[PDB]
Amino acid sequence: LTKQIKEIKEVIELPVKHPELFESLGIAQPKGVILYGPPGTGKTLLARAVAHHTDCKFIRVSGAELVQKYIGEGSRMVRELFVMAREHAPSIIFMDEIDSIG
Amino acid sequence: GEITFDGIGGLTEQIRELREVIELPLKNPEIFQRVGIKPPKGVLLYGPPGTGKTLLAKAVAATIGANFIFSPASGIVDKYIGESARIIREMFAYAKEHEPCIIFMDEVDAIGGRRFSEGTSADREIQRTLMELLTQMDGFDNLGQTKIIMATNRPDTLDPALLRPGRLDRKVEIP
Amino acid sequence: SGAAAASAAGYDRHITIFSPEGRLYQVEYAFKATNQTNINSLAVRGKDCTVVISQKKVPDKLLDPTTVSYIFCISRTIGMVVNGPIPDARNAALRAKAEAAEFRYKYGYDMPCDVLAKRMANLSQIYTQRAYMRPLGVILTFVSVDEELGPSIYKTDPAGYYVGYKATATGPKQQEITTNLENHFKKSKIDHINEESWEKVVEFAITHMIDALGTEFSKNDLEVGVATKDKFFTLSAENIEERLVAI
Amino acid sequence: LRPGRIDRKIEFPPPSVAARAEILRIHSRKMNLTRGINLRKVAEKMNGCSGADVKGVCTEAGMYALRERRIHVTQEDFELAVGKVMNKNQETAISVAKLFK
Amino acid sequence: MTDRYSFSLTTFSPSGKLGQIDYALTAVKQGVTSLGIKATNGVVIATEKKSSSPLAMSETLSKVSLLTPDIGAVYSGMGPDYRVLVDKSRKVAHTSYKRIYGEYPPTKLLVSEVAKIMQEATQSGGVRPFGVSLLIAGHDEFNGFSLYQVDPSGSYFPWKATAIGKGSVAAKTFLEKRWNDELELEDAIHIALLTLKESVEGEFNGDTIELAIIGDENPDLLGYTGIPTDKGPRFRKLTSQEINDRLEAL
Amino acid sequence: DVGGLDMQKQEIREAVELPLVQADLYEQIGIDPPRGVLLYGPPGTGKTMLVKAVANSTKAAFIRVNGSEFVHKYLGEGPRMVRDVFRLARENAPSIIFIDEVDSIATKRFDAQTGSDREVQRILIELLTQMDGFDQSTNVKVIMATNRADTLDPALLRPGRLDRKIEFPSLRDRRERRLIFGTIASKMSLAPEADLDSLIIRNDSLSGAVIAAIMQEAGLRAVRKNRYVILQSDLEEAYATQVKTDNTVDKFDFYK
Numbered sequence A: 001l002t003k004q005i006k007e008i009k010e011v012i013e014l015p016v017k018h019p020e021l022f023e024s025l026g027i028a029q030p031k032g033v034i035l036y037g038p039p040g041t042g043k044t045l046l047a048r049a050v051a052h053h054t055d056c057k058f059i060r061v062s063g064a065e066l067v068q069k070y071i072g073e074g075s076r077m078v079r080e081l082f083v084m085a086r087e088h089a090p091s092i093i094f095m096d097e098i099d100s101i102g
Numbered sequence B: 001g002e003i004t005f006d007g008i009g010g011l012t013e014q015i016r017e018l019r020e021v022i023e024l025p026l027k028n029p030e031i032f033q034r035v036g037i038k039p040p041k042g043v044l045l046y047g048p049p050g051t052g053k054t055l056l057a058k059a060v061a062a063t064i065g066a067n068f069i070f071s072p073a074s075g076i077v078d079k080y081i082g083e084s085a086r087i088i089r090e091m092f093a094y095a096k097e098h099e100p101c102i103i104f105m106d107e108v109d110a111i112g113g114r115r116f117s118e119g120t121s122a123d124r125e126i127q128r129t130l131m132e133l134l135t136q137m138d139g140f141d142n143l144g145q146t147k148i149i150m151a152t153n154r155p156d157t158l159d160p161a162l163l164r165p166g167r168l169d170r171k172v173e174i175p
Numbered sequence C: 001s002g003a004a005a006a007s008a009a010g011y012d013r014h015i016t017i018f019s020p021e022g023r024l025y026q027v028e029y030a031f032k033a034t035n036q037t038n039i040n041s042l043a044v045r046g047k048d049c050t051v052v053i054s055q056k057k058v059p060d061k062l063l064d065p066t067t068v069s070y071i072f073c074i075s076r077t078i079g080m081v082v083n084g085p086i087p088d089a090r091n092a093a094l095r096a097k098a099e100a101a102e103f104r105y106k107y108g109y110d111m112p113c114d115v116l117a118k119r120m121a122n123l124s125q126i127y128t129q130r131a132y133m134r135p136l137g138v139i140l141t142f143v144s145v146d147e148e149l150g151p152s153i154y155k156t157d158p159a160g161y162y163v164g165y166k167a168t169a170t171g172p173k174q175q176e177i178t179t180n181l182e183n184h185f186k187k188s189k190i191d192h193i194n195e196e197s198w199e200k201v202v203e204f205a206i207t208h209m210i211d212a213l214g215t216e217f218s219k220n221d222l223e224v225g226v227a228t229k230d231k232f233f234t235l236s237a238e239n240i241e242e243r244l245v246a247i
Numbered sequence D: 001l002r003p004g005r006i007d008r009k010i011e012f013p014p015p016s017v018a019a020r021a022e023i024l025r026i027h028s029r030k031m032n033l034t035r036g037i038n039l040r041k042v043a044e045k046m047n048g049c050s051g052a053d054v055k056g057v058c059t060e061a062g063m064y065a066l067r068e069r070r071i072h073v074t075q076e077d078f079e080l081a082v083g084k085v086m087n088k089n090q091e092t093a094i095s096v097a098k099l100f101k
Numbered sequence E: 001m002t003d004r005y006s007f008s009l010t011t012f013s014p015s016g017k018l019g020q021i022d023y024a025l026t027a028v029k030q031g032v033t034s035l036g037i038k039a040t041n042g043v044v045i046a047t048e049k050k051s052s053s054p055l056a057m058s059e060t061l062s063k064v065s066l067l068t069p070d071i072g073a074v075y076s077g078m079g080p081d082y083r084v085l086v087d088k089s090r091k092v093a094h095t096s097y098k099r100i101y102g103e104y105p106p107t108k109l110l111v112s113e114v115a116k117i118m119q120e121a122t123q124s125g126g127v128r129p130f131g132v133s134l135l136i137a138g139h140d141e142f143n144g145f146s147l148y149q150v151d152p153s154g155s156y157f158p159w160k161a162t163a164i165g166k167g168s169v170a171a172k173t174f175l176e177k178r179w180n181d182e183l184e185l186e187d188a189i190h191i192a193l194l195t196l197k198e199s200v201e202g203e204f205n206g207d208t209i210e211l212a213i214i215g216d217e218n219p220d221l222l223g224y225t226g227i228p229t230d231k232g233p234r235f236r237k238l239t240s241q242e243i244n245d246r247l248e249a250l
Numbered sequence F: 001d002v003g004g005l006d007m008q009k010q011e012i013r014e015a016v017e018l019p020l021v022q023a024d025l026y027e028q029i030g031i032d033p034p035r036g037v038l039l040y041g042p043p044g045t046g047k048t049m050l051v052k053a054v055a056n057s058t059k060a061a062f063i064r065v066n067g068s069e070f071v072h073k074y075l076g077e078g079p080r081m082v083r084d085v086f087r088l089a090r091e092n093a094p095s096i097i098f099i100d101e102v103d104s105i106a107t108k109r110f111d112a113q114t115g116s117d118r119e120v121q122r123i124l125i126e127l128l129t130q131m132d133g134f135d136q137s138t139n140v141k142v143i144m145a146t147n148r149a150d151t152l153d154p155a156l157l158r159p160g161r162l163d164r165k166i167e168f169p170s171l172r173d174r175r176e177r178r179l180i181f182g183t184i185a186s187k188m189s190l191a192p193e194a195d196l197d198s199l200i201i202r203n204d205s206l207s208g209a210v211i212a213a214i215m216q217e218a219g220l221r222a223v224r225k226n227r228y229v230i231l232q233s234d235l236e237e238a239y240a241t242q243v244k245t246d247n248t249v250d251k252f253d254f255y256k
């Protein structure tokens, strides 16, 4: 599969590599994707592989690392994430997510 | 003494069988090796509450002619919060050089505490106090000059992280 | 874990609900009722004569002991003894006594204890299908001296299980008794018992529910039945005075 | 799932047969790959309904050679691999008979 | 945790499934092992008798039972939901089919008249189903020998060689290791007891076992010699000694 | 010290012993090692003890733990566990794990209409994540024990997770039954008139745990008979001890 790639590097790298373009094209940068499909297809593969060829850094959170068993120990933890992004900007985040299940 | 009195009521086959469970490995145990088997390093005595077994184990080791000592598992964790397991090893060394001898210790379900209920480094006492127990009883070699007894009401509440497989091998209910 | 998910998640108050273990529990809770008297009967075969024995307790003095009895002469050639509370014994006794009859009105002879344990047990099943009725908290024994089979004992429980034993007891104290005649049979390898007279076979069955029961018995604490061809009836008190004199 | 948080999304389906052929060449780049192979066929003998079950196959094939102490393989050492991931998935949990049409 | 779509029957869950049937089929798998397999010239039906106490005469009650001379059965699971079933099954031959066709029925039309006696009790609350199963097996003269299963749901899967109860898959694993296409009855019979020597404990004699056959007519069981065409039964329960020699031939 | 059980042993020597002391094997061929395995089959069968021996030869570390411990009532007090051990099972590498029960917390479910059972998925999905996500390679951690294998999630059986099913006897394996008796007996001293061939076929169902419950009831009464040596007749009173039909506790009241 390679067509799938072309959408990633269209959203990820172009607003980072040289985004003067969008100011000519008169639209808004994008800010995320999501990727679905059965297991055993190679989706968590790709995010390991995207790291090699970024030039921008990388963050990873399997689900269930957020939870910390107290009331707000979790929602303090997400916020402790994003601030660690901005100072280290630019940055990418990768997430298996079921905290947002339900 | 080797001739001591034990004549309270209630129970006969128990005092009859512990005599089997515990006498022979102490008096002339040079046979358990050449026959082949390994004797039991330890024992457990479970049942319902309100039964008067503290005096029982106090008694039957006294008629047999064994040096008996007994300590609850409360003061070792009540008086001594974070200076406990020092007492354990001393309780054996003292017990060693006075070989042979029997142990008894009730409220044994207190060592669990958290039982690593969260794995935080605040319950090191409730964790290590199980550790030094196990490492020491493994150090006996089970020759036949030191044996151990434990007891509680809730063996289903027990900590089979150890004391189940081969340490407190023989489990014995009571009527 | 056994009944923990039972006592919490229903499964113990409706009859017609299975548990994921497969077990339904209501009928499995009926049997606790059978032992609510602390009573313990017995039954054995003969060459042609059958017997059943029961305690008959010594409560407060005001009773009239002629009527306290768990031995119900159903029809002729038939009889039964219960294990459980009295009221839930009658409704089984009476649903029968009007059932042997219509047979004899509709088929031309008297029922055996075979059918009478298959019929009444073909009903206690039904009442564990529908919600007509709480299953009767009993377990009841039958006796007879049949023409085609000889002596015969049968037994029935609130589910519907029925088998014709060779000898048996029941109540809170089966293990003690049952061993004190299971071992007896492997001695001799006779499904029945000797001592032709219905007299002499009683004293066999008394003494086995003395040594293995746990005490000594008078004439008043007992009540005893018997089955012989053409009849079923109850008895007098001298049969033990003509025991201990011999011993 | 709104735009403003995830502006597009992706479907990763399981592959075609001609699709899978390239998945094996990459997993087999370090295997020895004796000559007379048509691994455009092995895909067709068993559609790997995943895209990673094959990663066990190309592994599983070499495992035979290990047992024999051979280093290399041929087509045969693949043609039995399909016997394990596919058939033993149908002979894994299809073992009821009670069912309802 | 519970499910709140299982305490009752008329309720669907989001997977489009019903509650209590799924557990009744577990009430049998917890029960004893019983079976019946097939042959070219007959059918066999077997099970054992896990006699509870030693004092229970294990002969006054038959796992196996006759429905018509050409048709017999056996259960696996609960008992009282068997002898209450058959007593209203064999009737239905004598009520729905016989009296308006003269003769006893085929083997599958009997099953249809069982399985709705099984399905009347899974359509209205206030009725537990029959926590049992069945293996009906018989014969007739346009489709031939047969074998049939009957679950509590009212479905009747047919079969060739099968078993049920706790010791099922161990047995079903074994049949096709021994089963064929052209097999004969007296060859298909010692199979169906060496199948049962594995799913057992303790004693393995005629007084802890009982089974059946189907075959050619057994007119000696018939009783009324003198008619040319009324060939008698086709179903006979093998006595103890008739079994208790075959084991010593094995 | 173990009994017999020859080919079952042979397969984990392939899966576990080789990848820790031999790796050029798996490299030059053009593959990667298999990750862990599972050991299905009825209990009292030497599963756990085998895995202990495996450590004892290869000298590597060992972590024993039970699956009913990962479950916990405080939210997130479980997946902290499953992630904590790996944080150290790497540290003391090379290392492996045994789990004497995982069918408890592992079974297919069509959906969760509940809050508690949803966390059981949060348990598992981290376990399934740690092996497959980026990590080290010397761990061969997972050795899933159980009593059956017809219940697990095939998403746990995705090749890469587990690829070596393993099976052990249940009963009727007279060969594997007799074979252990000599081994345990090889430890003990017996008289020559002490034959055990009377014992094997007399049974119809037992296991490998009971036999030790028999031997340590066989060679226990000799000393009660104050003899330096055992005889035969002590034995026959044991096979009744570790036999069937101790007591019909609730055998009849269950269904009927």
Ligand SMILES: Nc1ncnc2c1ncn2[C@@H]1O[C@H](COP(=O)(O)OP(=O)(O)OP(=O)(O)O)[C@@H](O)[C@H]1O
Binding pocket: A001, A039, A040, A041, A042, A043, A044, A045, A046, A096, D023, D026, D051, D052, D055, F129, F132, F160
């Ligand atoms: N096209 C491919 N090239 C190489 N490997 C592949 C490919 N497709 C699948 N795989 C294999 O599939 C596995 C990865 O599976 P995948 O990452 O899709 O599951 P996952 O995304 O980890 O599931 P989840 O994220 O829900 O835990 C790897 O072992 C990889 O070798």
Ligand SMILES: Nc1ncnc2c1ncn2[C@@H]1O[C@H](COP(=O)(O)OP(=O)(O)O)[C@@H](O)[C@H]1O
Binding pocket: B008, B009, B010, B011, B048, B049, B050, B051, B052, B053, B054, B055, B106
């Ligand atoms: N069998 C017995 N004989 C005499 N006294 C008994 C007996 N069982 C219990 N007791 C009474 O109960 C008390 C001892 O019970 P205790 O040692 O507290 O039981 P446990 O150690 O299980 O808590 C004493 O006062 C004793 O008199």
Ligand SMILES: Nc1ncnc2c1ncn2[C@@H]1O[C@H](COP(=O)(O)OP(=O)(O)O)[C@@H](O)[C@H]1O
Binding pocket: F001, F002, F003, F004, F005, F042, F043, F044, F045, F046, F047, F048, F049, F100, F180, F207, F208, F209, F212
């Ligand atoms: N083949 C065998 N050889 C030696 N011991 C055995 C054998 N099979 C079982 N055992 C005994 O079984 C016990 C361990 O059983 P175990 O493997 O823990 O059961 P499970 O696998 O269900 O946990 C040990 O004490 C061991 O002596």
